[PDB]
Amino acid sequence: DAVHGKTHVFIRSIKNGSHMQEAKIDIKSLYDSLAKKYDVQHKNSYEVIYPKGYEIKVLGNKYVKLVAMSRHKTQKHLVKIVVKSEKTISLLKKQDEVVVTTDHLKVGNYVSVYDEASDKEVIGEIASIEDLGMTDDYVYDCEVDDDSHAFYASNILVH
């Protein structure tokens, strides 16, 4: 389990105790940015950043600390997951998509989805899963300060 670099995440950063900024940013962009600010630890093939004063939106539509972030090359296939939701406004149908790696979730399962326009969490259904094949690109991982161990990845809750 990692996510593709174009995965979107909701990030808050804090400075000087008193100032905070929040934005929706791609995870590769977040990584490259933090790479200038902090610096990478290394394991067998992981490059890891332990940022301070960063937070990420997770289950419960709340921001918790982003404790670490990493990237690595992977042998695993990229898998595109499409998730549908809807609300009555008269039906507004929505879908979101996230590309993850995994060696391991099922079409038909329900998953939590962040409805950004109404700033609330809704139930989504996995509508499709597609094997996109192997990749040469880096894939990314977050550790989040929440016992859900999950964060919203392009509006879809992922672990």
Residue numbers in the entry: -1, 1 to 15, 15A, 15B, 15C, 16 to 85, 95 to 109, 128 to 182
Authors' account:
Here, we report the novel and atypically split PolB16 OarG intein and its biochemical and structural characterization. The PolB16 intein carries an atypical split position close to the N-terminal end of the encoded split intein domain to give IntN and IntC fragments of 15 and 168 aa, respectively. Most notably, both residues at the 1 and +1 positions are serine. Furthermore, the intein overall exhibits the typical conserved motifs of a class 1 intein29 that represent conserved residues across inteins, of which some are involved in catalyzing the steps of the protein splicing pathway. This analysis suggested the PolB16 intein splices through linear and branched oxoester intermediates.
To this end, we genetically fused the IntN and IntC precursors, each with 10 extein residues, with a 3 amino acid linker (GSH). Ser1 and Asn183 at the splice junctions were mutated to alanine to block all splicing activity. We obtained protein crystals in this format for both the wild-type sequence and the cysteine-less double mutant (C111A, C165A) and could solve these at resolutions of 1.85 and 2.6 Å, respectively. Both structures were virtually identical (0.185 Å RMSD, root mean square deviation), consistent with the negligible functional impact of mutating the non-conserved cysteine residues. No sufficient electron density was found for a part within this region, D86-S95, suggesting it is mobile or less structured, as well as for the termini represented by extein residues (except Asp-1) and the ultimate N183A. The last well-resolved amino acids, Asp108 and His109, show a conformation of the polypeptide chain that departs from the canonical intein structure. As a consequence, His109 is placed in an unusual position, remote from the scissile bond, which is incompatible with its usual catalytic role. Trying to explain the unusual functional and structural detachment of motif N3:10 residue His109 from the splicing pathway and the intein's active site, we noted in the crystal structures that His68 is positioned in the vicinity of the upstream splice junction.
